[PDB]
Write a protein that binds this DNA or RNA. Structure first.
Ligand SMILES: [Mg+2]
Ligand SMILES: [Zn+2]
Lengths: 190, 163, 52, 198
RNA sequence: UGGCCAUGGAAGUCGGAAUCCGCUAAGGAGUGUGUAACAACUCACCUGCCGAAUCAACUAGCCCUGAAAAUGGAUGGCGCU
């Protein structure tokens, strides 16, 4: 039934400054801005506290599937804050039993050529979502590093190269190859 | 025994179980047997000699190899000694219906059974061991015409005699 | 051939999955019900058979 | 079940508290059932070992029972993976018996290193097997006629260092077990007085 | 504790009659994996952290799966949330 009220709080840290034009949070700090719109979620994004310390999200007269959004907005702002402060760092290790998936970034991070996958002549070119920047790591041999602020864009770009390197018309239990996400960490930990 | 073929002393033990008689299906030697100088048919005959005249209703066989001479012994299992102290002995081939008569008393005979346990059990003496071996019996069914379960609780004997 | 921790990482993505008994949908291994509206969230699931 | 048992557990701990005026709080830690049985067999005659929960948070009810103070000091120290050792002999002697028993228990991959672990120069005890597992990190190993021999006494892991996975597995194959401990002593109860392993 | 029946092997584990005690904090004469058979692994009782409800089995409403036909098509039509 209609729950008379639900809410939550999102305690912003003193480094970051968040601001909300209505229902369109914009979060800025060390690394950069991250806007996100929630016109489509239907909530009261109050912002309270001197020093602007916490973001509150009411949701009045919600039914079960309307009250399910409350936390997911709150959480999306949490990631947004993390992105601004620390920034996300997805690491993905290449795997093969023969053909050593030859990776090479191109423009800056943007492009990812993925040559010699399974001994295929086809060279996979994979763009990155605006903001994300791939880079071939050191201190680990067959391993990529995708860094960026907007987690959504990062993890999508990770998937983009994960599904790029897919095996068709074979026993995938046998043929375990491709560039898989190994670790979802941050650019700096504190 | 490590590099090629050398006996420095050889008092090597390995645990076989079951051995009423010779056994056609055997499986006595191989693997462990031939490498280590113990043969096959002679080792089976020596195993029959030790585990001959009781027990003929399953036995245990620790095999201490002294270079070529095996020393077979009967280390006691609780249910085996109960089946040894049954209404003997209709050995093999009828038989047949089956080996589960299980009305053979043993009141003070199980006192010897709890005594012959190789310490073990992490016990507070026979008071608790009496409860264990009085239930190990799948067949026996305790005294004259009793049950096992809760008659065990009211024991009035052999607390100080079993150490 | 292939580094063990690296292998188990690629298993996680390819082979550590539940499968729907109605519609063959490949599902995360924690799954109790299916994804698929086509089979009505069946719940008859089985694990994906391991390579011997 | 679990109402009569819970009452029976209260009766166990109170009777042990009434019988013995001295208790030894020991941390269980990464411990086996085989370890606990070995400790039971060693400390059979004198001591009685126990392993509890937040119904050891119940010494309060013993202290309530028209008699005891001093058990109020023991309430904060029932935290972590804790078990008791009730006994009547002595304190410093029992501490030495607990320290002397212990067990090997092979490498925990990821956890800290208590002492400077080494790899003595000796054969593994294998045929022509993977030397690449040993030489991946930084170890000098040769195939000196079949057996994989390590050619130098080298320190892999130092004090307060994290143990890697591949080096932990190689130590397990070699049967080298310096890691783990058995059980630790945090605090003591001796006829009212509290000590901290001293 | 190679428990008993079963030897073809089932020491918990193709099956079945059993089916209790000890230590117990507590572990079934065993849910499975797998083994010729073990092993090895996996599945209570209890803690450490976290911080109020949690969870099971039925039942009946709408909705959905179940639900495949041949000229292009019919809640009468347009449409409708
Ligand atoms: Mg094919
Ligand atoms: Zn389905």
């Amino acid at each position: 039934m209609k729950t008379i009220l639900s809410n939550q709080t999102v305690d912003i840290p003193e480094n970051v400054d968040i601001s909300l034009k209505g229902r369109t949070v914009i979060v800025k700090g060390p690394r950069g801005t991250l806007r996100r719109d929630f016109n489509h979620i239907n909530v009261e994004l109050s912002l309270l506290g001197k020093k602007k310390k916490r973001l509150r999200v009411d949701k009045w007269w919600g039914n079960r599937k309307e009250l399910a959004t409350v936390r997911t907005i709150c959480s999306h702002v949490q990631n947004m804050i993390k992105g601004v402060t620390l920034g996300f760092r997805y690491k993905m290790r290449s795997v093969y039993a023969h053909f050593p998936i030859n990776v090479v970034i191109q423009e800056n991070g943007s492009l990812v050529e993925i040559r010699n996958f399974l001994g295929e002549k086809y060279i996979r070119r994979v763009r990155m979502r605006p903001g994300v920047a791939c880079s071939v790591s050191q201190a680990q041999k067959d391993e990529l590093v995708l860094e960026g602020n907007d987690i959504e864009l990062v993890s999508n770009s990770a998937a983009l190269i994960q599904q790029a390197t897919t095996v068709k018309n074979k026993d995938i239990r046998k043929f375990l190859d491709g560039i898989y996400v190994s670790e979802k960490g941050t650019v700096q930990q504190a | 025994m490590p590099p090629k073929f050398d006996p420095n002393e050889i008092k090597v033990v390995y645990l076989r179980c079951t051995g009423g008689e010779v056994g056609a299906t055997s499986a006595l030697a191989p693997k462990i047997g031939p490498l280590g100088l113990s043969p096959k048919k002679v080792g089976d005959d020596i195993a029959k000699a030790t585990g001959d005249w009781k027990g003929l209703r399953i036995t245990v066989k620790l095999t201490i190899q002294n270079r070529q001479a095996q020393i077979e012994v009967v280390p006691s299992a609780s249910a085996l000694i109960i089946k040894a102290l049954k209404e003997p002995p209709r050995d093999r081939k009828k038989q047949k219906n089956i080996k589960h008569s299980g009305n053979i008393t043993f009141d003070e005979i199980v006192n010897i059974a709890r005594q012959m346990r190789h310490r073990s059990l992490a016990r507070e003496l026979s008071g608790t061991i009496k409860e264990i071996l009085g239930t190990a019996q799948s067949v026996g069914c305790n005294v004259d015409g009793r049950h096992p379960h809760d008659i065990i609780d009211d024991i009035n004997s052999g607390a100080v005699e079993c150490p | 051939i292939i580094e063990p921790s690296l292998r188990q990482l690629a298993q996680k993505y390819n082979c550590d999955k539940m499968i729907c008994r109605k519609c063959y949908a490949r599902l995360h291994p924690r799954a109790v019900n299916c994804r698929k509206k086509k089979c009505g969230h069946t719940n008859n699931l089985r694990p994906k058979k391991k390579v011997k | 079940d679990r109402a009569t048992w819970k009452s029976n557990y209260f009766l166990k701990i109170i009777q042990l508290l009434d019988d013995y005026p001295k208790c030894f709080i020991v941390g269980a830690d990464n411990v086996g059932s085989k370890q606990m049985q070995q400790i039971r067999m060693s400390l059979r005659g004198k001591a009685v070992v126990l392993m509890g929960k937040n119904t050891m948070m119940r010494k309060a009810i013993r202290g309530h029972l028209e008699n005891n103070p001093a058990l109020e000091k023991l309430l904060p120290h029932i935290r972590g993976n804790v078990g008791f050792v009730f006994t009547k002999e002595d304190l410093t002697e029992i501490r030495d018996m607990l320290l002397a028993n212990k067990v090997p228990a092979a490498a925990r991959a990821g956890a800290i290193a208590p002492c400077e672990v080494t790899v003595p120069a000796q054969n593994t005890g294998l045929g022509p097997e993977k030397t690449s597992f040993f030489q991946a990190l930084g170890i000098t190993t040769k195939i000196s006629r079949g057996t994989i021999e390590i050619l130098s006494d080298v320190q892999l892991i130092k004090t307060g260092d994290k143990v890697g996975a591949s080096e932990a597995t190689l130590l397990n194959m070699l049967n080298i077990s310096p890691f783990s401990f058995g059980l630790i002593i945090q605090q003591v109860f001796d006829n009212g007085s509290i000590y901290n392993p001293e």
